[PDB]
Amino acid sequence: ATLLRSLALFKRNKDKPPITSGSGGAIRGIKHIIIVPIPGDSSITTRSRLLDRLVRLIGNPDVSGPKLTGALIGILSLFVESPGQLIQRITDDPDVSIRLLEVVQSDQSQSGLTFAMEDEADQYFSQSRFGWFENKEISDIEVQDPEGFNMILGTILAQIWVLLAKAVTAPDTAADSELRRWIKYTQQRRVVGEFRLERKWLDVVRNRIAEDLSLRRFMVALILDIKRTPGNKPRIAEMICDIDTYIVEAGLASFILTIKFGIETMYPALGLHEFAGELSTLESLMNLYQQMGETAPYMVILENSIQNKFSAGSYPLLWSYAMGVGVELENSMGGLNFGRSYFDPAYFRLGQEMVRRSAGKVSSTLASELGITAEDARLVS
Amino acid sequence: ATLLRSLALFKRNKDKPPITSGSGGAIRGIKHIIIVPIPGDSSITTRSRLLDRLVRLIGNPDVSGPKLTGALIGILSLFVESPGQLIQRITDDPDVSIRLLEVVQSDQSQSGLTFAMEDEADQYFSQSRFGWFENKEISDIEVQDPEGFNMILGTILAQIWVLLAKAVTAPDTAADSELRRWIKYTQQRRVVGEFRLERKWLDVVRNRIAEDLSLRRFMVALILDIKRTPGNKPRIAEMICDIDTYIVEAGLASFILTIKFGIETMYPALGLHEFAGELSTLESLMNLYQQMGETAPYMVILENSIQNKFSAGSYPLLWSYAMGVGVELENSMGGLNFGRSYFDPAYFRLGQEMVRRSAGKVSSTLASELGITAEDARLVS
Amino acid sequence: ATLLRSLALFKRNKDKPPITSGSGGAIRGIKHIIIVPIPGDSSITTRSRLL
RNA sequence: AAAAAA
RNA sequence: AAAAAA
RNA sequence: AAAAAA
Numbered sequence: 149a150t151l152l153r154s155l156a157l158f159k160r161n162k163d164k165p166p167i168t169s170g171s172g173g174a175i176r177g178i179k180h181i182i183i184v185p186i187p188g189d190s191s192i193t194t195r196s197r198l199l200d201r202l203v204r205l206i207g208n209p210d211v212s213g214p215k216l217t218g219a220l221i222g223i224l225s226l227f228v229e230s231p232g233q234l235i236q237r238i239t240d241d242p243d244v245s246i247r248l249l250e251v252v253q254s255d256q257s258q259s260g261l262t263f264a265m266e267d268e269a270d271q272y273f274s275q276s277r278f279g280w281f282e283n284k285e286i287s288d289i290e291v292q293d294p295e296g297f298n299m300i301l302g303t304i305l306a307q308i309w310v311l312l313a314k315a316v317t318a319p320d321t322a323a324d325s326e327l328r329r330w331i332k333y334t335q336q337r338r339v340v341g342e343f344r345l346e347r348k349w350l351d352v353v354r355n356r357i358a359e360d361l362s363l364r365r366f367m368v369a370l371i372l373d374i375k376r377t378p379g380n381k382p383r384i385a386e387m388i389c390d391i392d393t394y395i396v397e398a399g400l401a402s403f404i405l406t407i408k409f410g411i412e413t414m415y416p417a418l419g420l421h422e423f424a425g426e427l428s429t430l431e432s433l434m435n436l437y438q439q440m441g442e443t444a445p446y447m448v449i450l451e452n453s454i455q456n457k458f459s460a461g462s463y464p465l466l467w468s469y470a471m472g473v474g475v476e477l478e479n480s481m482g483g484l485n486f487g488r489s490y491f492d493p494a495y496f497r498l499g500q501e502m503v504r505r506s507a508g509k510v511s512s513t514l515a516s517e518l519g520i521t522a523e524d525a526r527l528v529s
Numbered sequence: 530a531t532l533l534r535s536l537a538l539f540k541r542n543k544d545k546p547p548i549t550s551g552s553g554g555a556i557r558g559i560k561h562i563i564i565v566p567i568p569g570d571s572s573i574t575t576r577s578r579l580l581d582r583l584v585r586l587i588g589n590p591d592v593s594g595p596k597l598t599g600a601l602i603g604i605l606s607l608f609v610e611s612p613g614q615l616i617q618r619i620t621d622d623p624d625v626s627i628r629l630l631e632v633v634q635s636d637q638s639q640s641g642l643t644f645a646m647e648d649e650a651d652q653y654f655s656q657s658r659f660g661w662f663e664n665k666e667i668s669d670i671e672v673q674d675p676e677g678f679n680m681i682l683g684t685i686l687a688q689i690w691v692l693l694a695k696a697v698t699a700p701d702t703a704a705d706s707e708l709r710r711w712i713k714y715t716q717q718r719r720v721v722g723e724f725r726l727e728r729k730w731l732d733v734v735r736n737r738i739a740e741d742l743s744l745r746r747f748m749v750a751l752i753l754d755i756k757r758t759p760g761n762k763p764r765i766a767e768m769i770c771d772i773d774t775y776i777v778e779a780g781l782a783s784f785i786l787t788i789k790f791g792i793e794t795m796y797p798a799l800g801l802h803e804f805a806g807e808l809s810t811l812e813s814l815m816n817l818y819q820q821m822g823e824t825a826p827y828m829v830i831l832e833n834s835i836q837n838k839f840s841a842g843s844y845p846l847l848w849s850y851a852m853g854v855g856v857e858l859e860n861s862m863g864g865l866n867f868g869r870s871y872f873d874p875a876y877f878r879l880g881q882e883m884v885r886r887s888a889g890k891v892s893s894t895l896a897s898e899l900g901i902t903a904e905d906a907r908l909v910s
Numbered sequence: 911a912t913l914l915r916s917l918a919l920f921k922r923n924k925d926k927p928p929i930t931s932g933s934g935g936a937i938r939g940i941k942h943i944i945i946v947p948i949p950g951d952s953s954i955t956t957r958s959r960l961l
Numbered sequence: 962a963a964a965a966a967a
Numbered sequence: 968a969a970a971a972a973a
Numbered sequence: 974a975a976a977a978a979a
Contacts, residue, residue, distance in 0.1 A: 190559065229557045237555045294561040295594055295741070298624070316979095318969050325971090328870075332973055335962075336697070336832065337740050374556060378549040380831070382558030382623045383742045389834040390973085399968060399979085411536055412806030431532045434539040442547055448968075448979075459968095461978030477803055477846065479873055480971035487969085490977060503803075510800035517800075517911040519894040524797035527886050571940065610938045618936045675942040697973095699963050706965090713967055755937060759930040763939030771967085780962060780973085792917055812913045815920040823928055829962075829973075840962095842972030861965035868963085871971060 156428070163432040165439070165454060179245040182362075183272070184218040186231045188252035188264045192294040195226055197260055198251050199301060200290050205272075207279030207349050215272075216356050217363050221246070224308065224367065227301055227384035238370045244362045279349030283342055302384050303339040306330075306391065308353055312367050313394040315357040316449060322354065323347060329394065338387055361451060368446045371395070375442075399448030402460040402467060402486065403433065409477065410470030414513060415502040417469065422495075426463035433458055464490035472499020537809070544813040546820070546835060560626040563743075564653070565599040567612045569633035569645045573675040576607055578641055579632050580682060581671050586653075588660030588730050596653075597737050598744050602627070605689065605748065608682055608765035619751045625743045660730030664723055683765050684720040687711075687772065689734055693748050694775040696738040697830060703735065704728060710775065719768055742832060749827045752776070756823075780829035783841040783848060783867065784814065790858065791851030795894060796883040798850065803876075807844035814839055845871035853880020 185202065187194045205211065205219045225231040232248055239246050251269070254262040259273040291297050310329045314322035333339040357363055371392045374385045381389060397404050410418070411430065418427065436457070437444050448455045460467035468491060474481045508529035510520055566583065568575045586592065586600045606612040613629055620627050632650070635643040640654040672678050691710045695703035714720040738744055752773045755766045762770060778785050791799070792811065799808065817838070818825050829836045841848035849872060855862045889910035891901055949956045 192559070195559070227558065228555070229559050234555055237552065293594070294559055298559070298561075314969090316968075321969070328972095332962090336973060338832070338973095372547075373552045375547045375834075376550050376552055377556055378551045379621055379623070380746060381834070382556065384558070385556055386742070386832065386834055390832075390837065393834075393837040394972075401970070402968085402979095405970085407536070407539070408806060411532065412809065413802045414805055415802055427532050431535045434535050437539065438542050451979090455968095456979065459978060464978080474970095478971070480845075480871060482970075484970035485968085488978090506802060510797055511802055511805065514800040514802075514805055517913070518795055518797070519897075520797050520800055521893045524893060525800075527890075528798045528801070528883075573940070576940070608939065609936070610940050615936055618933065675940055679940070679942075695963090697962075702963070709966095717967060719967095753928075754933045756928045757931050757933055758937055759932045763937065765939070766937055775966075782964070783962085783973095786964085788917070788920070792913065808913050812916045815916050818920065819923050832973090836962095837973065840972060845972080855964095859965070863964075865964035866962085869972090 159428055160432050160435070163429075163436055163457060165436070177243040179243065180214060181245055181247045182214045182218040182221070184235060184246050184248040185222045185251045185272070186235070186248050187226065188250035190229060192297050193290075193292060194251070194253050194261075196290045196292070196297050196300075197253055199223060199226055199297075199304065200288060201259055201261060201273045203289070203304060203345075203349075204278065204280065205274075206352055207346075209277055213360070216352070217360060218246075220308070220353065220356065220363060221366055223304060224370070227298075227305065227382065234370070238366055238373060240369065241362055241365050277348075279346045279352060281342075282344050282346050286343065289343070298383065299340050300343060302387055303343045304345070305384060306333050306339050306387055307345055307350065309367070309388055309391040310394065311350060311354045311357055312364070312449065313391070313398050315354050316364070316451070317399045319354055319358050323350075326350075329391070333387070338390075364449055364451075368395075368443070368449055372442060372446075395449060396445040398446075400445070400455070400458055401484070403458045405474060405481070405484075406430070406460065406463070406467050406470040407434065408470070409473040410466050410499075413473055413477075414511075415473070415506065417498060417502050423466045423469065426466040429463050430466065460488065461490050464488075464492055465495050468492045468495040469499035472496040472501075473503055475500060476503040540809055541813050541816070544810075544817055544838060546817070558624040560624065561595060562626055562628045563595045563599040563602070565616060565627050565629040566603045566632045566653070567616070567629050568607065569631035571610060573678050574671075574673060575632070575634050575642075577671045577673070577678050577681075578634055580604060580607055580678075580685065581669060582640055582642060582654045584670070584685060584726075584730075585659065585661065586655075587733055588727075590658055594741070597733070598741060599627075601689070601734065601737065601744060602747055604685060605751070608679075608686065608763065615751070619747055619754060621750065622743055622746050658729075660727045660733060662723075663725050663727050667724065670724070679764065680721050681724060683768055684724045685726070686765060687714050687720050687768055688726055688731065690748070690769055690772040691775065692731060692735045692738055693745070693830065694772070694779050696735050697745070697832070698780045700735055700739050704731075707731075710772070714768070719771075745830055745832075749776075749824070749830055753823060753827075776830060777826040779827075781826070781836070781839055782865070784839045786855060786862070786865075787811070787841065787844070787848050787851040788815065789851070790854040791847050791880075794854055794858075795892075796854070796887065798879060798883050804847045804850065807847040810844050811847065841869065842871050845869075845873055846876050849873045849876040850880035853877040853882075854884055856881060857884040 185198060187198050202219050202223050206216060211219070221235065225234045228234045235246050235248055250264045251261050252264045253260060254266065257266050257270055259270045261273065262269045289300050291300060307330070310326040314325055330344065334341045371388060374381065374389045375392070377385060380386070407430065440447065443450070471486050472495065510525045510528050515525070566579060568579050583600050583604050587597060592600070602616065606615045609615045616627050616629055631645045632642050633645045634641060635647065638647050638651055640651045642654065643650045670681050672681060688711070691707040692703070695706055711725065715722045752769060755762065755770045756773070758766060761767070788811065821828065824831070852867050853876065891906045891909050896906070947960060949960050
């Protein structure tokens with residue numbers, strides 16, 4: 149009686165994150181500078197030419213690590229006026245000091261851009277291995293009207309933000325899926341259809357986003373800044389806050405799914421005592437998921453320290469049950485790979501059979517809600 | 530017991546929109562100016578000649594993007610006195626700065642309008658490819674009496690506001706349907722019957738409204754301003770607030786419909802455990818639909834970020850069930866296309882059969898409301 | 911059980927008219943004058959001849 | 962994203 | 968770590 | 974003191 153109250157407080161502080169008082173500057177990463185080219189002026193011509201040079205900058209093999217990181221941050225912030233104030237607002241990272249150099253257009257330079265310095269600029273910005281748009285009839289995207297820039301910018305960013313959904317979880321599998329989101333934005337007339345980048349260009353970005361952590365911290369934390377914008381967003385932000393729904397819980401699909409099929413379906417095989425403790429583990433992780441705040445759905449994009457805590461190994465039987473339930477109830481979850489060292493297939497087939505036995509077997513915990521008679525429950529069977 | 534209370538709070542903040550505190554001017558779109566010609570004076574003669582020049586301005590192939598946007602905003606606000614104060618009241622858009630130039634009539638100009646500047650004006654305003662009224666006996670609509678203008682203005686606006694209903698959802702299918710609303714307003718004597726524009730004129734507007742977002746934000750947000758007008762509206766506003774009923778939830782017909790046929794019919798195949806969680810997903814989206822306020826029904830006209838949340842993919846089984854129910858119960862919903870990658874036809878035919886089995890099978894949850902006997906329920910069968 | 915209470919509030923605000931706070935003189939129609947002849951005096955003879 | 966709605 | 972989601 | 978846990 150007093151054991152169960154002591155047990156409930158024992159389990160919730162075991163999952164509870166340690167309260168981060170802080171070490172007063174003790175643990176600080178050594179910072180490497182990242183060269184972020186930001187347009188010098190508000191005019192469209194500069195934004196357009198910098199977007200032209202940064203897109204082909206990324207494709208070449210020659211570019212190093214943080215040169216590719218700053219070129220990506222260079223175009224993930226071209227949609228705002230004053231991109232320099234956007235970067236310093238977002239970078240709460242300890243490992244990275246962003247030094248950001250303004251880029252103004254020029255007449256004398258080979259690339260057409262100088263730094264606000266004409267040969268150091270082209271040394272920054274500069275045939276089968278070069279990545280580009282997949283229809284090679286387009287050589288230069290430099291445009292003049294700003295809505296022609298704003299459509300050619302979202303066509304580039306909607307092919308980079310969709311990579312973040314499936315960069316840490318399924319890089320190999322991913323190329324099949326981001327073409328479906330490309331059909332979504334082409335048919336919505338959000339993006340321009342002929343400017344689809346090569347898979348070779350995107351494999352440079354996708355193996356970059358998967359590799360470094362400092363780019364995934366920037367990309368998550370600006371999405372969390374896009375989401376906070378009060379009014380109607382600018383039309384690139386209202387697209388970046390459209391792609392994010394594919395990134396929200398991108399890798400918690402052994403926990404989000406278990407809750408969806410184990411807990412919520414409420415088959416009578418939850419009153420097993422074998423599950424009676426792994427519900428109490430899982431009711432704490434549901435309470436923990438808003439204790440983590442709004443950075444909770446991105447805890448495996450960001451590689452947070454407590455995505456080990458939402459792992460299915462702490463509830464391996466109730467996970468396998470909700471694997472068994474969700475194979476029949478989804479034609480999509482048949483494509484889900486779930487192979488782990490704690491799989492327990494005995495439970496999985498017990499959870500498969502609960503779906504099959506109760507096929508036309510209208511419940512008792514939702515029939516009193518409606519008033520289902522024995523006359524009515526036979527008609528469903 | 531305490532699991533289900535933790536589960537209910539876990540599901541409602543998962544759907545809950547992030548509270549928009551704001552980034553303090555961090556994310557601001559680069560603004561392109563849009564040339565909006567507004568009549569210089571209150572007199573009818575100017576309004577009439579500007580409406581004449583803006584209607585033929587739209588038809589020609591030569592007009593660019595935002596020149597077509599400002600010409601449309603130029604005529605979507607001719608019905609008010611002081612159209613300049615209407616535009617600044619509505620444009621809460623970050624992507625668009627409306628600069629609006631007054632237009633006064635002239636004797637010396639070729640078009641007949643100057644800017645309050647005689648050659649820059651006709652350079653703004655100016656044979657098979659030109660779009661016009663479908664009966665070519667009418668060349669000029671310039672009229673003098675103001676009720677002859679107010680009827681020739683509503684005849685133009687009731688052919689543009691009906692495009693917004695089916696511009697983002699069914700542009701190809703749409704031309705069959707807006708002729709039915711044209712019969713509605715002709716038989717109500719709301720519009721003048723001989724001034725029907727070409728489909729070639731309307732295809733310029735419909736492929737414009739579908740393309741840009743900044744025109745759909747203006748058209749929605751003034752409808753929300755028409756709706757707020759306290760007394761009896763002016764007779765164009767009482768027509769724009771008549772067309773809007775065709776635009777309210779124009780594209781949520783996988784959610785509005787599911788609720789109408791899945792939830793509300795209350796067949797005994799809702800006590801399935803396969804649906805018992807997708808009711809709780811769908812009871813949050815019903816609570817979310819007024820948490821979004823009065824801009825909720827337009828969330829797919831405006832391409833809001835959380836029309837992915839009312840998508841049927843989060844409840845794909847209970848959607849397919851309400852697809853199965855609604856095919857028999859409507860001779861209209863047989864024309865509904867519902868083809869998605871999450872369709873699950875097993876459920877669809879389970880929802881088709883619940884309509885067919887309970888044909889003459891008066892319920893138990895509404896018979897106690899009336900007092901239906903076994904004598905009376907046999908008479909319905 | 912709590913679905914039906916959420917359903918009943920969902921259907922009544924869908925039909926509910928939007929509360930007309932007002933746009934503060936933003937949407938005003940252009941007014942055309944209408945000539946209304948009204949009798950000058952209370953006497954019956956004028957009312958009769960105007961009718 | 963899709964139907965119908967004086 | 969893996970699926971699907973206008 | 975013993976296992977497993979992206």
